[PDB]
Amino acid sequence: MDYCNKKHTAEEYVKISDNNYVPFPEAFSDGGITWQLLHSSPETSSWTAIFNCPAGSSFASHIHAGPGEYFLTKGKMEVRGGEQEGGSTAYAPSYGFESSGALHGKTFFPVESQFYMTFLGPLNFIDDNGKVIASIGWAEAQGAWLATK
Amino acid sequence: MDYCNKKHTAEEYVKISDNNYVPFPEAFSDGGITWQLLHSSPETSSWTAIFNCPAGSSFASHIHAGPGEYFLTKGKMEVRGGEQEGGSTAYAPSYGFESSGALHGKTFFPVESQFYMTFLGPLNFIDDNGKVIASIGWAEAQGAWLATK
Amino acid sequence: MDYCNKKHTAEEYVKISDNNYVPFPEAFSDGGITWQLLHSSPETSSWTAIFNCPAGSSFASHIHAGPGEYFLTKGKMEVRGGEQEGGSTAYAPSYGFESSGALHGKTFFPVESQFYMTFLGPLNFIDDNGKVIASIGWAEAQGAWLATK
Amino acid sequence: MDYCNKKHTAEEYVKISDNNYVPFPEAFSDGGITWQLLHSSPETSSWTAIFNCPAGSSFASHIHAGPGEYFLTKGKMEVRGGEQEGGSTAYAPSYGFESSGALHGKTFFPVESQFYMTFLGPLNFIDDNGKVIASIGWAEAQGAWLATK
Ligand SMILES: [Zn+2]
Ligand SMILES: [Zn+2]
Ligand SMILES: [Zn+2]
Ligand SMILES: [Zn+2]
């Protein structure tokens, strides 16, 4: 009924160890992709993670509901079809801004790579007809991360 | 490629006139709900709108992907089942913060009401088996607004 | 050093009573402006409030660090100098989007007014030479609110 | 005035080359810190950059108006005084969430390092008494970047 007093949000520190990477859900990827969830902002709805991708691996088709920013630290990544199809081809080290609405039918890694990314909102994985089969946000990502970890 | 130079985003002013309220899609509501899209932030993925709701009207079942804030200027609104079912019943004038993940089965207006609201991210409308039949973000809302208007 | 588990953020409901409006700080306004702080998002850094402005009142000079959106429910408001000086003159009911960087030397109310507003980030109040004398965000706003009521 | 139509925000790709690192302003750091601005969101108020910091270098005293997230790819970094003073001592590779209100009196790099970071809102640099002497956001950061091209 009344204004809710708030306290300063706690700062966080997460050491990234090779030992903590786990298999990324097979339902949403191809190839032995592994990852780590690094942070969730339940109030903002943003989340951050890091990924290791083998040569020839990819992610299932999805649309970004909000802006996402990536930092490719190792390898090469083809987004939105790669440069050969009007999209972008990233070489490490590099950065990218993938806006709200960005369609990623098959983000592909031709070489063993690694990339860090922050997402605002969910990733809507779609079927061959463009219908949403699953809306994956911080909560769904955290559920999967802890279910495997 | 290279860093993209940016300029100051333009400020906006929108007069709210009775003449511009249009019928809200029948697929996602019941009763003669009318509305007006006021602003869309394509970079942030946030959007803002105002609604006029007849007595007995409601919205179809949906989940808030991100935080949303409402200012009920007139009437009464039963959110998350209303006070009688553990949720809240807003009485004008009042404010509300509905967080990311909030499930709104049938937001109901017992009396003729009006409310202003800002949304971060999309509203995922679901069927009786939990499946997301439509992810409505700034882009989808603008499309429905301009198509009807 | 490890990932921090998060839980769904709590929803909020705030009844706005005429009895809870208190005097806005005299150092940052002129005339007899009264207000109420409605919500703070310590994680996002956004905050929301509502103001009652007497005829002839105004706010001290400031720059918006981030985007702010207002809903003028009563009266008239001159922002950025008003229409007569390249800015905007708002008439109730109306909406407005004031972007990051917006300079508000003396937001003025020629007539008794009222407006609701959401802010992302702080408002940097500046002196006549443009030097920042106070950066007011959700924390500073909550501090002033709890100290007066 | 009426609703302003919007279109999908353009995706971006930026190659991080050593050709682009330039000296960071000496008025806000000590040591030979170099950097690259990667992205500015004028609508959202967020911005992103990457820094190369020599052993013994540091940043001038500041407070984060909003949340910031970093990825330390090389070296070591002491934040909020280091674990020695109730803060954190980050070792590459590691991640950190520095919330709104975070006080960074003298972020220090004992060894040659590198870190990528996203900021929401400005960094308020303060004098010895705690007075804001400079509010640096995307616009101020872009100005410094373009100037020292
Ligand atoms: Zn994607
Ligand atoms: Zn809802
Ligand atoms: Zn202002
Ligand atoms: Zn800092």
Side-chain angles (χ1 to χ4, degrees):
Chain A
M1 292 280 286
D2 303 312
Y3 172 74
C4 295
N5 306 317
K6 298 294 172 59
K7 274 102 291 181
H8 171 268
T9 299
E11 292 92 353
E12 297 169 17
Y13 172 68
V14 181
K15 174 61 184 180
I16 302 171
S17 301
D18 300 327
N19 314 61
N20 292 321
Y21 281 95
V22 304
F24 187 71
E26 301 177 305
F28 310 85
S29 65
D30 186 45
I33 293 176
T34 53
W35 76 311
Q36 279 194 55
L37 178 60
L38 297 169
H39 172 270
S40 280
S41 271
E43 192 178 74
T44 308
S45 86
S46 67
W47 48 294
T48 304
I50 183 163
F51 311 77
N52 282 323
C53 317
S57 62
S58 54
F59 288 98
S61 302
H62 63 279
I63 297 172
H64 284 254
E69 299 183 77
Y70 69 76
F71 180 15
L72 183 64
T73 59
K74 292 185 272 188
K76 178 155 87 159
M77 175 178 70
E78 302 180 329
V79 197
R80 287 173 282 96
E83 184 172 53
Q84 63 265 52
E85 290 298 307
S88 289
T89 294
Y91 294 85
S94 56
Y95 161 85
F97 182 74
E98 295 300 310
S99 55
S100 166
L103 171 68
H104 293 165
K106 190 176 182 178
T107 294
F108 189 69
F109 308 85
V111 116
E112 182 178 56
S113 315
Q114 182 182 83
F115 80 93
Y116 167 97
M117 187 163 197
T118 54
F119 314 81
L120 180 51
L123 297 184
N124 294 337
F125 286 86
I126 56 177
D127 58 39
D128 294 314
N129 185 41
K131 313 293 87 173
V132 184
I133 51 191
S135 190
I136 307 297
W138 68 271
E140 292 67 30
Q142 174 176 279
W145 162 251
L146 300 175
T148 69
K149 200 69 194 312
Chain B
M1 62 169 96
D2 308 307
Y3 171 76
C4 301
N5 294 333
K6 298 292 167 57
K7 288 197 170 182
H8 181 253
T9 299
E11 292 97 353
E12 299 162 25
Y13 172 62
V14 182
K15 183 64 180 63
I16 303 173
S17 312
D18 287 341
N19 292 172
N20 293 331
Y21 282 91
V22 298
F24 190 72
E26 284 196 302
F28 313 88
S29 60
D30 180 66
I33 294 183
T34 50
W35 75 309
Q36 277 194 56
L37 180 62
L38 300 171
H39 173 267
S40 173
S41 267
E43 188 177 77
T44 305
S45 83
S46 57
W47 45 295
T48 304
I50 184 162
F51 311 74
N52 281 332
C53 317
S57 67
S58 61
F59 288 96
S61 298
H62 58 278
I63 296 175
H64 285 256
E69 297 184 77
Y70 69 77
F71 178 15
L72 181 64
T73 54
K74 179 185 184 57
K76 306 153 81 117
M77 176 174 73
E78 284 165 24
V79 195
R80 286 173 282 99
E83 207 178 318
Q84 65 274 200
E85 278 181 53
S88 297
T89 299
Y91 280 56
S94 54
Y95 158 88
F97 176 78
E98 296 292 318
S99 59
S100 165
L103 178 63
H104 296 162
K106 191 177 180 184
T107 295
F108 189 72
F109 303 86
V111 103
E112 188 156 64
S113 317
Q114 174 179 279
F115 77 95
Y116 166 93
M117 185 161 191
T118 50
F119 313 84
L120 181 58
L123 299 194
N124 293 336
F125 290 83
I126 55 179
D127 66 22
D128 287 334
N129 194 39
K131 305 301 179 171
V132 176
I133 51 75
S135 189
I136 307 299
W138 70 270
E140 294 71 27
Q142 173 175 271
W145 164 246
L146 299 178
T148 301
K149 192 73 163 51
Chain C
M1 290 203 288
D2 305 315
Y3 173 74
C4 299
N5 291 186
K6 297 293 167 67
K7 297 292 298 181
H8 174 266
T9 300
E11 296 93 353
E12 302 173 8
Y13 171 64
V14 181
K15 184 62 189 304
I16 302 174
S17 306
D18 300 326
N19 309 284
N20 292 323
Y21 280 89
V22 302
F24 189 73
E26 287 180 23
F28 310 84
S29 59
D30 183 278
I33 299 178
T34 54
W35 76 312
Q36 281 196 57
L37 177 64
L38 300 173
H39 171 271
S40 283
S41 269
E43 189 179 78
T44 309
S45 88
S46 60
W47 48 291
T48 307
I50 186 171
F51 313 75
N52 277 340
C53 314
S57 60
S58 58
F59 288 94
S61 308
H62 62 277
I63 295 177
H64 285 246
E69 300 179 81
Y70 71 75
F71 177 15
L72 184 66
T73 53
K74 314 179 181 181
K76 179 164 68 169
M77 173 177 75
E78 305 182 332
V79 60
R80 284 172 287 103
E83 61 174 357
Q84 63 269 50
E85 305 296 311
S88 298
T89 294
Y91 293 75
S94 61
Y95 162 86
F97 181 75
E98 296 296 313
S99 62
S100 171
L103 169 70
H104 294 175
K106 185 181 181 174
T107 294
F108 188 69
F109 305 87
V111 126
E112 184 174 295
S113 312
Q114 174 182 276
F115 75 97
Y116 168 94
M117 191 158 189
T118 49
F119 311 84
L120 180 56
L123 299 184
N124 296 328
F125 287 85
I126 56 176
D127 63 34
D128 291 306
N129 289 132
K131 199 179 192 300
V132 180
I133 66 184
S135 181
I136 304 306
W138 72 272
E140 296 67 37
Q142 171 176 274
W145 166 251
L146 295 184
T148 305
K149 185 61 185 300
Chain D
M1 309 216 306
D2 314 309
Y3 171 80
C4 296
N5 300 293
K6 305 291 175 67
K7 82 190 164 62
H8 178 269
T9 305
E11 294 89 357
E12 290 164 29
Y13 167 64
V14 178
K15 179 66 178 62
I16 300 175
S17 174
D18 297 317
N19 292 106
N20 306 49
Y21 284 94
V22 297
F24 189 71
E26 48 190 350
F28 303 92
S29 57
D30 182 31
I33 296 185
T34 52
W35 78 312
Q36 280 196 52
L37 180 58
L38 297 169
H39 174 271
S40 283
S41 274
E43 190 182 82
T44 303
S45 173
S46 60
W47 46 295
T48 304
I50 186 163
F51 312 73
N52 279 334
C53 320
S57 62
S58 59
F59 289 101
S61 301
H62 62 280
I63 298 175
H64 284 253
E69 284 177 277
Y70 70 73
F71 181 7
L72 181 62
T73 57
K74 181 210 222 305
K76 167 193 277 200
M77 177 182 69
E78 305 188 321
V79 300
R80 286 173 279 108
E83 99 285 17
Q84 185 86 64
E85 304 169 57
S88 297
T89 294
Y91 292 78
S94 59
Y95 160 86
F97 178 79
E98 296 295 317
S99 62
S100 168
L103 169 66
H104 294 169
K106 190 188 189 63
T107 295
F108 188 70
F109 307 86
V111 127
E112 195 186 321
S113 309
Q114 174 178 283
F115 74 97
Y116 167 94
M117 185 160 197
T118 51
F119 311 85
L120 178 51
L123 301 182
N124 296 327
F125 290 84
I126 57 177
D127 62 38
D128 208 304
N129 304 309
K131 288 280 297 179
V132 177
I133 61 181
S135 185
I136 309 305
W138 70 273
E140 290 69 31
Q142 172 176 270
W145 168 256
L146 294 184
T148 69
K149 210 63 185 66

